[PDB]
Coordinates of C-alpha atoms (C1' of nucleotides) in Angstrom, one line a residue:
Chain A
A1 CA 63.4 94.9 242.7
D2 CA 62.9 92.0 245.3
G3 CA 59.6 90.3 244.9
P4 CA 56.3 90.5 242.6
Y5 CA 54.5 93.9 242.5
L6 CA 51.9 95.7 240.6
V7 CA 52.4 99.1 238.4
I8 CA 49.9 101.4 236.8
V9 CA 51.0 101.2 233.0
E10 CA 48.4 104.0 232.2
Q11 CA 46.9 106.3 234.9
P12 CA 43.2 107.5 234.7
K13 CA 42.3 110.8 233.1
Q14 CA 42.8 113.3 236.0
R15 CA 40.2 115.6 234.5
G16 CA 37.4 115.4 232.2
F17 CA 35.4 112.4 233.3
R18 CA 32.0 112.8 234.4
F19 CA 30.5 110.9 237.5
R20 CA 27.0 109.4 236.8
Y21 CA 23.9 109.1 239.2
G22 CA 21.6 106.0 239.1
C23 CA 18.9 107.5 237.2
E24 CA 21.2 108.6 233.9
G25 CA 21.6 105.2 233.1
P26 CA 24.3 102.2 233.2
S27 CA 25.8 103.0 229.9
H28 CA 27.3 106.5 229.5
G29 CA 30.8 105.7 228.5
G30 CA 34.1 104.4 230.3
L31 CA 36.6 106.4 232.5
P32 CA 39.6 106.9 229.8
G33 CA 43.4 106.8 230.5
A34 CA 45.6 109.9 230.8
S35 CA 46.6 109.6 226.9
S36 CA 43.2 109.0 225.4
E37 CA 42.1 111.3 222.4
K38 CA 40.9 110.8 218.7
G39 CA 40.0 107.3 217.6
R40 CA 43.3 106.4 219.7
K41 CA 41.4 105.5 223.0
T42 CA 43.2 104.3 226.0
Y43 CA 42.0 103.0 229.4
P44 CA 43.6 102.8 233.1
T45 CA 46.0 100.1 232.8
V46 CA 48.3 98.0 235.2
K47 CA 50.5 95.1 234.9
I48 CA 51.9 92.5 237.3
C49 CA 56.0 92.6 237.5
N50 CA 58.3 90.0 238.6
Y51 CA 55.9 87.2 238.0
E52 CA 54.3 85.4 235.0
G53 CA 51.4 82.9 235.5
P54 CA 47.6 83.4 236.5
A55 CA 46.2 86.3 238.5
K56 CA 43.1 88.3 239.0
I57 CA 43.3 92.3 239.6
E58 CA 40.5 94.0 241.4
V59 CA 39.7 97.6 241.2
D60 CA 37.6 99.8 243.8
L61 CA 37.2 103.4 244.6
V62 CA 38.9 105.0 247.6
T63 CA 39.3 108.4 248.7
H64 CA 41.7 111.4 248.1
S65 CA 42.6 110.9 251.7
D66 CA 46.3 109.6 251.7
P67 CA 45.3 106.7 254.3
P68 CA 42.9 105.1 251.7
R69 CA 39.5 104.1 252.9
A70 CA 36.8 102.8 250.6
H71 CA 34.9 105.6 248.7
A72 CA 31.0 106.1 248.7
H73 CA 31.0 105.9 245.1
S74 CA 30.9 102.7 243.3
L75 CA 32.6 101.3 240.0
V76 CA 29.9 100.1 237.6
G77 CA 30.6 98.1 234.2
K78 CA 30.6 94.7 232.4
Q79 CA 33.5 93.2 234.5
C80 CA 32.0 94.5 237.9
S81 CA 29.9 93.2 240.8
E82 CA 27.3 95.1 242.6
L83 CA 29.7 96.0 245.5
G84 CA 31.4 98.4 243.3
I85 CA 34.5 95.9 242.6
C86 CA 35.7 95.6 239.1
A87 CA 38.1 92.4 238.4
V88 CA 40.0 91.1 235.4
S89 CA 42.1 87.9 235.0
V90 CA 45.7 87.9 233.6
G91 CA 46.9 84.6 231.6
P92 CA 50.6 83.7 231.9
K93 CA 51.2 85.4 228.4
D94 CA 49.9 88.9 229.2
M95 CA 50.0 90.4 233.0
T96 CA 48.7 93.4 231.8
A97 CA 45.2 94.4 232.4
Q98 CA 42.9 97.1 230.7
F99 CA 39.9 98.5 232.4
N100 CA 37.7 99.9 229.5
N101 CA 34.1 100.0 230.7
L102 CA 34.8 102.0 234.0
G103 CA 32.4 104.2 235.3
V104 CA 31.5 105.7 238.5
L105 CA 28.4 106.0 240.2
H106 CA 27.7 109.1 242.1
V107 CA 25.5 108.6 245.4
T108 CA 23.1 111.1 246.6
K109 CA 24.1 112.9 250.0
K110 CA 20.4 111.3 251.0
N111 CA 21.5 107.9 250.0
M112 CA 25.3 108.3 251.3
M113 CA 24.9 107.2 254.9
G114 CA 22.9 104.1 254.3
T115 CA 25.0 102.9 251.2
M116 CA 28.5 103.6 253.3
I117 CA 27.2 101.1 256.1
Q118 CA 26.7 98.3 253.5
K119 CA 30.4 98.7 252.1
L120 CA 31.5 99.1 255.8
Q121 CA 30.0 95.7 256.7
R122 CA 32.7 94.0 254.7
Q123 CA 35.5 94.9 257.3
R124 CA 33.0 93.5 259.9
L125 CA 33.3 90.2 257.7
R126 CA 37.0 89.6 258.1
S127 CA 37.2 90.1 262.1
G128 CA 31.3 86.2 262.1
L129 CA 32.0 89.7 263.8
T130 CA 28.7 89.7 265.6
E131 CA 26.4 92.5 264.4
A132 CA 26.2 93.5 268.0
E133 CA 29.3 95.7 267.3
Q134 CA 27.7 97.7 264.6
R135 CA 27.6 100.8 266.5
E136 CA 31.4 100.9 267.2
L137 CA 31.5 100.6 263.1
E138 CA 29.1 103.6 262.5
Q139 CA 30.4 106.8 263.6
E140 CA 33.2 106.3 261.4
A141 CA 30.7 107.0 258.5
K142 CA 29.0 109.8 260.4
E143 CA 32.4 111.6 260.3
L144 CA 33.5 110.3 257.2
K145 CA 30.5 111.6 255.7
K146 CA 31.7 115.5 256.6
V147 CA 35.2 114.8 255.3
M148 CA 34.8 112.7 252.4
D149 CA 35.3 114.5 248.8
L150 CA 32.7 113.2 246.4
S151 CA 34.1 115.5 243.6
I152 CA 37.6 113.5 243.9
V153 CA 38.3 109.7 243.8
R154 CA 41.2 107.5 243.3
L155 CA 41.3 104.0 242.0
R156 CA 42.9 101.0 244.3
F157 CA 44.4 98.2 242.2
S158 CA 44.6 95.0 244.1
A159 CA 46.3 92.0 242.4
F160 CA 46.1 88.3 243.3
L161 CA 48.0 85.4 242.2
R162 CA 46.5 82.0 242.1
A163 CA 47.5 79.0 244.2
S164 CA 47.6 75.6 242.9
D165 CA 44.0 74.9 244.5
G166 CA 42.0 77.2 246.9
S167 CA 43.1 79.7 244.1
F168 CA 43.6 83.4 243.9
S169 CA 44.4 83.6 247.8
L170 CA 47.7 84.9 247.6
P171 CA 48.0 88.9 247.5
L172 CA 50.2 91.6 246.0
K173 CA 50.8 95.1 247.6
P174 CA 48.1 97.3 246.5
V175 CA 48.6 100.4 244.1
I176 CA 46.6 103.9 244.3
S177 CA 46.3 105.8 241.0
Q178 CA 46.2 109.5 240.8
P179 CA 43.2 111.6 241.9
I180 CA 40.2 111.7 239.4
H181 CA 38.4 114.9 239.6
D182 CA 34.5 114.5 238.5
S183 CA 34.3 117.0 235.3
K184 CA 31.0 118.1 236.5
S185 CA 32.4 119.9 239.4
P186 CA 33.3 123.7 239.4
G187 CA 37.2 124.0 238.8
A188 CA 37.4 120.3 237.6
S189 CA 37.5 121.5 233.9
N190 CA 40.4 121.9 231.6
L191 CA 40.9 125.6 231.0
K192 CA 40.8 126.0 227.3
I193 CA 41.5 129.3 225.2
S194 CA 39.4 128.6 222.1
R195 CA 40.2 132.0 220.1
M196 CA 41.2 135.5 220.6
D197 CA 40.8 138.4 218.3
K198 CA 44.4 139.7 218.9
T199 CA 47.9 137.9 218.9
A200 CA 50.2 140.9 218.7
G201 CA 50.5 144.2 220.2
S202 CA 52.9 147.3 221.1
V203 CA 55.3 146.9 223.7
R204 CA 53.4 149.8 225.4
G205 CA 50.7 147.7 226.3
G206 CA 47.0 148.5 226.8
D207 CA 45.8 147.0 223.4
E208 CA 42.2 145.4 223.9
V209 CA 41.9 141.6 223.5
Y210 CA 38.8 139.7 223.2
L211 CA 39.6 136.2 224.6
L212 CA 36.8 133.2 224.0
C213 CA 37.0 130.3 226.4
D214 CA 35.4 127.4 228.2
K215 CA 33.8 127.9 231.5
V216 CA 35.6 130.3 233.7
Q217 CA 34.9 131.2 237.3
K218 CA 34.3 135.2 237.4
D219 CA 37.0 136.3 240.1
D220 CA 38.8 132.8 240.1
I221 CA 40.5 133.8 236.7
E222 CA 43.4 135.8 235.3
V223 CA 45.5 136.2 232.3
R224 CA 49.2 135.3 232.6
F225 CA 52.0 136.7 230.1
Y226 CA 55.2 134.8 230.8
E227 CA 58.5 134.1 229.3
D228 CA 59.6 130.6 229.8
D229 CA 63.2 131.2 229.0
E230 CA 64.0 134.8 229.4
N231 CA 64.4 134.8 233.4
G232 CA 60.8 134.1 234.3
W233 CA 59.6 137.7 233.6
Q234 CA 55.6 137.7 233.9
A235 CA 52.8 140.1 233.7
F236 CA 49.1 139.9 233.8
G237 CA 46.0 141.4 231.5
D238 CA 44.1 144.0 233.3
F239 CA 40.2 143.6 233.5
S240 CA 37.5 143.6 235.9
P241 CA 35.1 140.6 236.8
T242 CA 32.6 142.8 234.8
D243 CA 34.7 141.8 231.7
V244 CA 34.1 138.3 232.4
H245 CA 31.1 137.7 229.8
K246 CA 28.7 134.7 230.7
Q247 CA 31.7 132.8 232.1
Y248 CA 32.9 132.3 228.3
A249 CA 34.8 135.6 227.2
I250 CA 37.1 137.9 229.0
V251 CA 37.6 141.5 227.6
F252 CA 41.2 142.6 228.7
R253 CA 44.1 145.0 228.0
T254 CA 47.6 143.5 227.5
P255 CA 50.2 144.2 230.0
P256 CA 53.5 146.2 228.9
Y257 CA 56.6 144.2 227.7
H258 CA 59.3 144.1 230.6
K259 CA 62.0 145.5 227.8
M260 CA 60.7 148.6 225.9
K261 CA 63.9 149.2 223.9
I262 CA 62.9 146.3 221.8
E263 CA 64.3 146.7 217.9
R264 CA 62.8 143.3 216.6
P265 CA 59.6 141.9 217.8
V266 CA 59.6 139.2 220.6
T267 CA 57.0 136.2 220.7
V268 CA 55.7 135.5 224.2
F269 CA 53.0 133.1 226.0
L270 CA 49.8 134.0 227.8
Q271 CA 47.5 131.8 229.4
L272 CA 44.8 131.6 231.7
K273 CA 45.3 130.7 235.2
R274 CA 43.0 130.3 238.4
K275 CA 43.8 132.4 241.3
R276 CA 43.4 129.6 243.6
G277 CA 43.1 126.5 241.5
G278 CA 46.9 127.3 240.4
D279 CA 46.4 125.3 237.1
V280 CA 46.9 126.9 233.8
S281 CA 45.1 126.8 230.3
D282 CA 46.9 125.6 227.4
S283 CA 49.2 128.5 226.3
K284 CA 49.0 130.8 223.2
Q285 CA 51.8 132.9 221.5
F286 CA 51.5 136.7 221.4
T287 CA 54.0 139.0 219.7
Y288 CA 55.2 142.3 220.6
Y289 CA 56.2 145.1 218.3
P290 CA 58.5 147.9 219.1
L291 CA 57.7 151.7 219.4
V292 CA 57.9 153.3 216.1
Chain B
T1 CA -12.7 156.1 227.1
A2 CA -15.8 154.2 228.7
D3 CA -17.8 157.1 230.6
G4 CA -18.7 155.5 234.0
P5 CA -15.9 154.8 236.7
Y6 CA -12.9 152.6 235.4
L7 CA -9.3 151.2 236.4
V8 CA -6.3 152.1 234.7
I9 CA -2.4 150.6 234.9
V10 CA -0.6 154.0 235.3
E11 CA 2.8 152.0 235.5
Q12 CA 2.8 148.3 234.0
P13 CA 5.1 145.7 235.5
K14 CA 8.6 145.0 234.0
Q15 CA 8.1 142.4 231.2
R16 CA 11.5 140.5 231.3
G17 CA 13.6 141.1 234.4
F18 CA 11.9 139.5 237.3
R19 CA 12.9 136.4 239.0
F20 CA 10.1 133.8 240.4
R21 CA 10.8 132.4 243.6
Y22 CA 10.2 129.2 245.5
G23 CA 8.9 128.3 249.0
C24 CA 12.4 127.5 250.5
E25 CA 14.2 130.4 248.9
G26 CA 12.7 133.1 251.0
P27 CA 10.0 135.6 251.6
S28 CA 11.7 138.9 251.0
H29 CA 14.0 138.5 247.8
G30 CA 13.0 141.5 245.9
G31 CA 9.6 143.0 244.7
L32 CA 8.4 143.1 241.2
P33 CA 9.3 146.7 239.8
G34 CA 7.9 148.7 237.0
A35 CA 8.6 149.0 233.4
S36 CA 10.3 152.5 234.1
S37 CA 12.6 151.4 236.9
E38 CA 16.6 151.6 237.0
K39 CA 19.2 151.1 239.8
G40 CA 18.6 154.8 240.7
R41 CA 14.8 155.6 240.0
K42 CA 13.0 152.6 241.1
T43 CA 9.4 152.4 240.1
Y44 CA 6.6 149.9 241.2
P45 CA 3.5 148.6 239.3
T46 CA 0.9 151.2 239.7
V47 CA -2.9 151.7 238.9
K48 CA -5.4 154.6 239.4
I49 CA -9.2 154.6 239.7
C50 CA -10.6 157.3 237.3
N51 CA -14.2 159.1 237.0
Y52 CA -14.6 158.6 241.0
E53 CA -13.3 160.1 244.0
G54 CA -13.9 158.3 247.3
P55 CA -12.9 155.2 249.4
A56 CA -12.2 152.0 247.2
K57 CA -10.0 148.7 247.7
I58 CA -7.9 147.7 244.8
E59 CA -6.9 143.8 244.9
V60 CA -4.4 142.1 242.7
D61 CA -3.9 138.5 241.7
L62 CA -1.8 136.2 239.2
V63 CA -3.5 135.2 235.9
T64 CA -2.7 133.0 233.1
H65 CA -1.1 134.3 229.6
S66 CA -3.9 132.8 227.8
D67 CA -6.3 135.7 227.0
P68 CA -9.2 134.1 228.5
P69 CA -7.9 135.0 232.2
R70 CA -8.1 132.3 234.6
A71 CA -6.3 132.1 238.1
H72 CA -2.7 131.0 237.9
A73 CA -0.7 128.3 239.8
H74 CA 1.4 130.9 241.2
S75 CA 0.6 133.0 244.3
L76 CA 1.5 136.7 245.2
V77 CA 3.6 136.7 248.5
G78 CA 3.9 140.4 250.1
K79 CA 3.4 142.6 253.2
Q80 CA -0.1 143.2 251.5
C81 CA -1.5 139.5 250.5
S82 CA -3.6 136.8 251.3
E83 CA -2.6 133.1 251.8
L84 CA -4.4 132.8 248.6
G85 CA -2.0 134.9 246.7
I86 CA -4.3 138.0 246.7
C87 CA -2.9 141.4 247.7
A88 CA -5.2 144.4 248.7
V89 CA -4.9 148.3 249.0
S90 CA -7.1 151.0 250.1
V91 CA -7.3 154.3 248.6
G92 CA -8.9 157.3 250.2
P93 CA -10.9 160.0 248.6
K94 CA -7.7 162.1 248.0
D95 CA -5.4 159.7 246.4
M96 CA -7.0 157.3 244.1
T97 CA -3.7 155.6 243.3
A98 CA -2.4 152.5 244.3
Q99 CA 1.4 151.5 244.0
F100 CA 2.7 148.0 244.7
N101 CA 6.1 147.9 245.9
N102 CA 6.6 144.5 247.8
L103 CA 5.0 142.3 245.2
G104 CA 6.8 139.1 244.5
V105 CA 5.7 135.9 242.8
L106 CA 5.8 132.4 244.3
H107 CA 6.9 129.6 242.2
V108 CA 4.8 126.3 242.8
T109 CA 6.6 123.0 242.6
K110 CA 5.1 120.5 239.6
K111 CA 4.5 118.2 242.5
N112 CA 2.6 121.0 244.3
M113 CA 1.1 122.4 241.6
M114 CA -2.2 120.2 241.2
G115 CA -3.2 120.2 244.6
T116 CA -2.5 124.0 244.9
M117 CA -4.5 124.6 241.8
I118 CA -7.8 123.2 243.1
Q119 CA -7.5 125.5 246.3
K120 CA -7.9 128.5 244.4
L121 CA -10.7 127.0 242.5
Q122 CA -12.8 125.9 245.4
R123 CA -12.0 129.4 246.6
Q124 CA -13.5 130.9 243.7
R125 CA -16.9 129.0 243.3
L126 CA -17.3 128.3 247.1
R127 CA -19.0 131.7 247.5
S128 CA -22.0 130.6 245.3
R129 CA -22.4 127.4 247.1
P130 CA -21.3 128.7 250.7
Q131 CA -22.6 125.8 253.1
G132 CA -21.1 122.8 251.1
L133 CA -20.1 121.3 247.8
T134 CA -21.0 118.2 245.8
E135 CA -18.8 115.2 245.1
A136 CA -19.8 115.8 241.4
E137 CA -18.1 119.2 241.3
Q138 CA -15.3 117.9 243.5
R139 CA -14.2 115.6 240.7
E140 CA -15.6 118.2 238.0
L141 CA -13.2 120.9 239.6
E142 CA -10.3 118.2 239.5
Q143 CA -11.1 117.9 235.8
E144 CA -10.8 121.6 235.0
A145 CA -7.4 121.5 236.9
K146 CA -5.9 118.4 235.2
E147 CA -6.2 120.5 231.8
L148 CA -4.9 123.6 233.2
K149 CA -1.9 121.8 234.5
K150 CA -1.5 120.5 230.9
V151 CA -1.5 124.0 229.2
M152 CA -0.4 126.5 231.9
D153 CA 2.9 128.3 231.3
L154 CA 4.7 128.8 234.4
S155 CA 7.4 131.1 232.8
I156 CA 4.9 133.8 232.2
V157 CA 2.1 135.4 234.5
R158 CA 0.0 138.6 234.2
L159 CA -1.4 140.6 236.9
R160 CA -5.2 141.1 237.4
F161 CA -5.9 144.4 239.1
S162 CA -9.7 144.4 240.6
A163 CA -11.2 147.7 242.1
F164 CA -14.3 148.0 244.4
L165 CA -16.1 151.3 245.6
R166 CA -17.5 151.0 248.9
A167 CA -21.4 151.6 249.3
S168 CA -23.3 153.7 251.9
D169 CA -23.3 150.0 254.0
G170 CA -19.4 149.9 254.8
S171 CA -19.1 146.8 252.1
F172 CA -16.3 147.5 249.3
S173 CA -18.9 145.4 247.0
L174 CA -19.3 147.7 244.2
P175 CA -16.9 146.1 241.5
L176 CA -15.2 147.9 238.8
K177 CA -14.2 146.0 235.4
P178 CA -10.8 144.1 236.1
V179 CA -7.6 145.1 234.4
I180 CA -5.1 142.9 233.2
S181 CA -1.3 144.1 232.9
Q182 CA 1.2 143.1 230.2
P183 CA 2.7 139.5 230.4
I184 CA 5.5 139.1 233.1
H185 CA 8.4 136.7 232.0
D186 CA 10.4 134.6 234.6
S187 CA 13.9 135.9 234.5
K188 CA 15.0 132.4 235.6
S189 CA 12.8 130.5 232.9
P190 CA 13.9 128.5 230.1
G191 CA 15.1 130.0 227.1
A192 CA 13.9 132.9 224.6
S193 CA 15.5 135.7 226.5
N194 CA 15.5 139.2 225.1
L195 CA 18.6 139.2 222.8
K196 CA 21.3 141.9 223.8
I197 CA 24.6 143.0 222.1
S198 CA 26.8 143.4 225.3
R199 CA 29.7 144.7 223.0
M200 CA 31.8 143.9 219.8
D201 CA 35.5 144.1 219.1
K202 CA 35.1 146.1 215.8
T203 CA 32.7 148.9 215.1
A204 CA 34.1 149.8 211.4
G205 CA 35.5 148.1 208.5
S206 CA 35.5 148.5 204.5
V207 CA 32.7 148.4 202.0
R208 CA 34.2 145.1 200.8
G209 CA 33.2 143.5 204.2
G210 CA 35.1 140.0 205.4
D211 CA 36.3 141.9 208.4
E212 CA 36.4 139.6 211.2
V213 CA 34.2 140.9 214.3
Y214 CA 34.0 139.2 217.8
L215 CA 30.4 139.9 219.2
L216 CA 29.3 139.1 222.9
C217 CA 25.8 138.5 223.3
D218 CA 23.2 137.0 225.8
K219 CA 22.1 133.4 224.9
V220 CA 22.0 132.4 221.5
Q221 CA 21.1 129.1 219.6
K222 CA 23.7 128.5 217.3
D223 CA 21.6 127.6 213.9
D224 CA 18.4 129.5 214.7
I225 CA 20.4 133.0 214.9
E226 CA 21.7 135.3 212.5
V227 CA 23.6 139.2 212.3
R228 CA 21.5 141.4 210.2
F229 CA 23.1 144.8 208.8
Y230 CA 20.3 146.8 207.6
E231 CA 19.9 150.5 206.6
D232 CA 16.4 151.1 208.0
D233 CA 15.2 154.4 206.3
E234 CA 17.0 153.8 203.1
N235 CA 14.3 151.3 201.3
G236 CA 15.6 148.4 203.8
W237 CA 19.0 147.5 202.2
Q238 CA 19.9 144.5 203.9
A239 CA 23.0 141.9 204.4
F240 CA 24.2 139.4 206.9
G241 CA 27.2 138.7 208.8
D242 CA 29.3 135.4 207.7
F243 CA 29.7 132.6 210.1
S244 CA 29.1 128.8 210.5
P245 CA 27.4 127.4 213.6
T246 CA 30.8 126.3 214.6
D247 CA 31.5 130.3 214.8
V248 CA 29.1 130.7 217.5
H249 CA 31.1 130.2 220.8
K250 CA 29.3 128.4 223.9
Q251 CA 25.9 130.5 222.7
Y252 CA 27.5 133.8 224.3
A253 CA 29.5 134.8 221.3
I254 CA 29.6 135.1 217.8
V255 CA 32.7 135.5 215.4
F256 CA 31.7 136.6 211.9
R257 CA 33.0 138.4 209.0
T258 CA 31.0 141.9 207.8
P259 CA 29.1 141.6 204.8
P260 CA 29.9 143.9 201.9
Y261 CA 28.3 147.2 201.5
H262 CA 25.4 147.2 198.6
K263 CA 27.2 150.4 196.9
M264 CA 31.1 150.6 196.7
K265 CA 33.2 153.5 195.3
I266 CA 31.6 155.7 197.9
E267 CA 34.0 158.6 199.2
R268 CA 32.2 159.1 202.7
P269 CA 31.9 156.6 205.3
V270 CA 28.0 155.3 205.7
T271 CA 26.9 154.5 209.2
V272 CA 24.6 151.4 209.3
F273 CA 23.0 149.5 211.9
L274 CA 23.5 145.8 212.9
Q275 CA 21.4 143.5 215.0
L276 CA 20.7 139.9 216.0
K277 CA 17.4 138.1 214.7
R278 CA 16.1 134.7 215.5
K279 CA 15.1 133.8 211.7
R280 CA 13.2 131.0 213.0
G281 CA 11.2 133.9 214.9
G282 CA 11.3 137.8 214.2
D283 CA 13.2 138.8 217.5
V284 CA 15.8 141.4 217.4
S285 CA 18.6 142.8 219.8
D286 CA 19.0 146.5 220.3
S287 CA 20.9 147.6 217.2
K288 CA 24.3 149.0 217.1
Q289 CA 25.8 151.5 214.8
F290 CA 28.6 150.2 212.3
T291 CA 30.8 152.3 209.9
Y292 CA 32.0 151.4 206.5
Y293 CA 35.0 153.2 205.0
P294 CA 35.9 153.8 201.2
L295 CA 38.0 151.6 199.4
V296 CA 42.2 152.4 200.1
Chain C
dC1 C1' 17.2 142.0 257.9
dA2 C1' 16.2 143.1 252.8
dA3 C1' 17.5 143.3 247.8
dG4 C1' 19.7 141.0 244.5
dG5 C1' 22.6 137.4 243.0
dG6 C1' 24.8 133.3 242.0
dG7 C1' 25.9 128.4 242.3
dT8 C1' 24.4 122.8 243.4
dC9 C1' 22.3 118.8 243.3
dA10 C1' 20.1 115.4 240.9
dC11 C1' 17.7 114.1 237.1
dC12 C1' 16.1 114.4 232.5
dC13 C1' 16.6 114.9 228.0
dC14 C1' 19.7 116.1 223.3
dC15 C1' 22.9 115.2 220.1
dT16 C1' 25.8 111.9 217.4
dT17 C1' 28.3 106.8 215.3
Chain D
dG1 C1' 18.8 101.1 217.9
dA2 C1' 21.9 101.3 221.8
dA3 C1' 26.8 103.2 223.1
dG4 C1' 29.1 107.2 224.2
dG5 C1' 29.1 111.9 224.9
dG6 C1' 26.9 116.4 226.1
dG7 C1' 23.5 119.9 227.4
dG8 C1' 19.4 121.8 229.8
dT9 C1' 15.7 122.0 233.5
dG10 C1' 13.3 122.1 237.9
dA11 C1' 13.8 123.1 242.8
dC12 C1' 17.2 124.3 246.2
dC13 C1' 20.9 126.6 248.6
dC14 C1' 23.5 130.1 249.2
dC15 C1' 26.8 134.9 248.9
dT16 C1' 27.5 139.8 248.6
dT17 C1' 26.3 144.4 249.8
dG18 C1' 23.8 148.0 252.5

DNA sequence: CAAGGGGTCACCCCCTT
DNA sequence: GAAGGGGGTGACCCCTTG
């Protein structure tokens, strides 16, 4: 309520965006919003609230860590500087800003240390801070380099409202986005079930199903058969990691249905679920016919 | 065979399966096995000297896939070898057979390659000019390299076994003809692996066809692959499985429909073979049996 | 260790509109 | 033709089992 503030209208896509190295190019596509699909494209959006008037909103990459420190990666795009800082303006009509050419520069573990000290030199600006105390600033990097996840970043939106003259000096409280997992990292993809040869079985179980999927980790996968409504009953499909073919298929058997006194058939859901990730695949329906 | 004394490969190297290793990876990662080997019976590349009993030294070096055999960029690293990549064994008058059981293949870096290449060259024609060489052949030798670095397949090597019979002197200086092995494809080399049918969800059907089969395979390129249903002895009746490139899942499965049998209104089930075939090329999977049943 | 496997980092190219 | 995706390739780095 009380005061002007910033809000993320549309969060960045948590999974599916690929980070890029310097060599790959400058133009490989922008980080979409969480509702991007089809030709209906969306981008990360924020708006200023409890204020109408000229403002500039900036964006920078910060860590997964809850105390937000600046990330080793940079943002590149049409709006952006070389510092990794993307900035947009909002006119007095429209206080909402879309960021539509946002890209994530992936630093090399070689490059990391050097490139980090340049971004760090900024907080030496705030407090003609004599280069004498560079050694004080450094060890932060040296240990930030061991604890810092390069598979995950978050966006930090910092809004500023224009003064009459000596403009855009008045700051709003900053707003941190949801985490953004590099798509090119291992458990960073969406589990998708592409196709399966069977969508029905006997209440008995032990019908063999060939399931086609996108990349799945050999022993980090399982096959959950669950009922949302009926008292959380669940079971699993039984297979050895040998039955994971080339990380794109699973041959398994069905688990028996909890109630085998079935008279009429019962539709169920089955999904893929990482054993440590926790995150499931988009679920598919499976039907169970009674003993005859 | 040719009457005078000669060398024979008793057991060839594994053609498809063996992984080449970089300098970094480590020096004991496995030995190049033989074409007979399995998890239980392990066998290693073996050769024998024939039409001669006595002391002899057999050496082995990597040469190109190219029929004119030139020295390969890769080296052999082993409990038996030189730094130059040349492994030697001695065979006394009783035993004229040499097994090589710790043979491994050093993969050179494309940055290392050209320099490393000219060492094996100087080392070859340094024995004909044993005091020094000429700037003329230095630059000439580089030229021979440059042209070999253009055309040398690093995914394939062959072994070149060269025997020597020891004279009265004490010198193993009497040379036999060299014998070149069948080619050795890097397991971890791009593309063109042996096609394998891992398993299939259906092994039967109807004469009609149009029965949906999920086939699990090793890496296949969507457009350039097919699924051949043939009767090998019966005048080559053949058909194909029915699928779009969209139906080839992540290059490691194929969902297809079975082709109709050539002759309907049979009364007894006809068992046939099906295989994968790079139609661009001519390659084929280990065939699998498929049964066709009578109508209703 | 040795004997086999994976995955990974960067970079490099390949499709499509 | 670049934009906007996606896949593949070398060199390297690891991890189980004994």
